[PDB]
Amino acid sequence: GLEAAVDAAYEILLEELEKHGVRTIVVVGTGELALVLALAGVRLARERGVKTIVLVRDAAAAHRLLAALAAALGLPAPASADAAALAAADAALWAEHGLRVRVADLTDPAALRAALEALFAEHGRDDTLVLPAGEAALAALEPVLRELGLEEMAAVAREVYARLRAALAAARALEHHHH
Questions:
Q1: Domains of the chain
Q2: Cα separation of 154 and 141, whole Å?
Q3: Which three-class secondary structure state does DSSP give residue 23?
């Protein structure tokens, strides 16, 4: 179920924060692992002051993730995927909970590089853990990081992803809410 998945992801992230001195987590992609990482990020922000930013492919994906986060927090979802509504929801989520949800076209390497570069300008590269939310995101993220010369960051992204993938396969976040 969802709690077991969030707990397992939280434990993995705690191990990485201690291992790498992480101050900021950037999640690239959508789906169940993106939600689980965002929810673990809510706990990590409250308990450790570590901020999390999720980069999703389009405004529709941002609305879907913000709506699931809203439900988890007991808060209203944004009324629509209007950019102004999404930006306002994002600013509120950041101020109150240390989480962001931003739009970046992951099919476009230049757009993903630009979104990462914005986050690196805000949060730096040394203390930032970048994680893909799935296989497709890993395949998009690795070459971009490698082009930027961030080989260690790419290596950690792949290794931590493998552990998260295995943990979520066992935890089954959504098992109770579909056939």
A1: 2-177 (3.40.50.1100)
A2: 8
A3: coil
Quoted resolution (Å) = 1.5
The SS3 call for residue 75 is coil
Phi/psi at 128 (5° precision):
-115, 125
Long-range contacts of 69-77 (CB under 8 A, 24+ apart): 69/35, 69/38, 69/39, 69/42, 69/93, 69/99, 69/101, 72/39, 72/42, 73/42, 73/97
Tokens at 17, concatenated: 């924060």
Rg of the Cα atoms in the chain: 15
What sign results for the dihedral spanned by CA atoms 38, 55, 171, 19? negative
Q: What is the residue whose two structure tokens read 């690196």?
A: 120
HEC string of 102-153 equals EECCCCCHHHHHHHHHHHHHHHCCCCEEEEECCHHHHHHHHHHHHHCCCHHH
Which structure tokens are listed for 38?
């965002």
User: Which residues, 6 or more positions from 44, have their beta carbon under 8 angstroms from its beta carbon?
Assistant: 10, 13, 14, 17, 25, 50, 52, 98
